Design an enzyme around this catalytic site. Structure first.
Site, mmCIF file in Angstrom:
data_model
loop_
_atom_site.group_PDB
_atom_site.id
_atom_site.type_symbol
_atom_site.label_atom_id
_atom_site.label_comp_id
_atom_site.label_asym_id
_atom_site.label_seq_id
_atom_site.Cartn_x
_atom_site.Cartn_y
_atom_site.Cartn_z
ATOM 1 C CG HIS A 1 -10.607 -23.271 3.084
ATOM 2 N ND1 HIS A 1 -10.971 -23.722 1.822
ATOM 3 C CD2 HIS A 1 -10.291 -24.377 3.831
ATOM 4 C CE1 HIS A 1 -10.902 -25.040 1.842
ATOM 5 N NE2 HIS A 1 -10.509 -25.454 3.033
ATOM 6 C CG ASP B 1 -11.215 -21.607 -0.785
ATOM 7 O OD1 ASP B 1 -11.851 -22.625 -0.437
ATOM 8 O OD2 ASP B 1 -10.158 -21.282 -0.187
ATOM 9 N N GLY C 1 -9.742 -32.611 4.318
ATOM 10 C CA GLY C 1 -8.297 -32.896 4.174
ATOM 11 C C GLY C 1 -7.814 -32.689 2.757
ATOM 12 C CB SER D 1 -9.145 -27.891 1.340
ATOM 13 O OG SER D 1 -10.369 -28.156 1.969
ATOM 14 C CB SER E 1 -13.187 -24.689 -2.732
ATOM 15 O OG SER E 1 -13.799 -23.870 -1.756
#
EC number: 3.4.21.12
Lengths: 198, 4
Positions: free
Chosen positions: A36, A63, A141, A143, A159
């Site tokens: 993502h 992801d 942030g 991720s 994720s």
């Protein structure tokens, strides 16, 4: 740039995400992150300098992603913990109940335990299946950031989860947090990647 | 849940 798990990186001078884990693919340097975060070919930057572009990703469904970096980057088998570091020793998957920590540019280093495996996240974009759930807090942030055990066993990259109005799940009790991570194992096999360890 |  020194490549460390947990550090900030921007995508196409817009979004921010966190570095997962330094990896290699033959002579090619890279880091694993969340899918993502960027689309194939987006440009990754660290402290304002170009470091690489996204080589591949899968999102939604899964992801995951890997950024291939220029030769000038220094890959390190470490994950940021304040000013300290957690050495990456391998990728043995911990079981439900194990303690685990995560590192990311928003909330720094947070620990908790794994509460469930194979969870589906219903994101606006589509479902994300097979995630592992932890109760360490996180915020927008984080991720792509690293999930690792104190012993140095790499678990996956951040994720999503249940962010409250303040941008994180830190103000809610551990029992109410659902912090989801993508397992590292399948990302490593899928792309033919090797983890940098120390 | 949201990505992040």
């Amino acid at each position: 740039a020194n490549i460390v798990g947990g550090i900030e990186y921007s995508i196409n001078n817009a979004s921010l995400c966190s570095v997962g884990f330094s990896v290699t693919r033959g002579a090619t340097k890279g880091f694993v992150t969340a899918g993502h975060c960027g689309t194939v070919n987006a440009t990754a930057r660290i402290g304002g300098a170009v470091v690489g572009t996204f080589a591949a990703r899968v999102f939604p469904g899964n992801d995951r992603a890997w950024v291939s970096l220029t030769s000038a980057q220094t890959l390190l088998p470490r994950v940021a913990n304040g000013s300290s570091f957690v050495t990456v020793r391998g990728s043995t998957e911990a079981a439900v109940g194990a303690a685990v920590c995560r590192s990311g540019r928003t909330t720094g280093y947070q620990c908790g335990t794994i509460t469930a495996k194979n969870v589906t996240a219903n994101y606006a974009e589509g479902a994300v299946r097979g995630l592992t759930q932890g109760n360490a807090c996180m915020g927008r942030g984080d991720s792509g950031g690293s999930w690792i055990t104190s012993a140095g066993q790499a678990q996956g990259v951040m994720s999503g989860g249940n962010v409250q109005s303040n941008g994180n799940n830190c103000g809610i009790p551990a029992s109410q947090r659902s912090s989801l991570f993508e397992r590292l194992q399948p990302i490593l096999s899928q792309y033919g990647l090797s983890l940098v360890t120390g | 849940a949201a990505p992040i």
